[PDB]
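Q: Could you fold this chain for me?
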Amino acid sequence: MKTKLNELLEFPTPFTYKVMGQALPELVDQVVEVVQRHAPGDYTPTVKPSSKGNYHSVSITINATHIEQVETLYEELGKIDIVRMVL
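A: Sure. Below is the predicted structure, expressed as structure tokens.
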């Protein structure tokens, strides 16, 4: 595929990302749902206590076949109105 946004080189590379922000219970649900719909295989975000129970920093693993694909996947899981961010 060649769209210069979700697919171009067609090569699934390991993207070590960290979605840090507010502690969201649906974060792991959207992380595995958006990472599977775009890249083959199920993945999850390892949440860790960074500052408090209200704010959590998770490490999401993703094998997006394109560079910009992992960017849209982060927006799909981090679309909450609260502070959402990714490494």
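A (continued): The radius of gyration is 13 Å.
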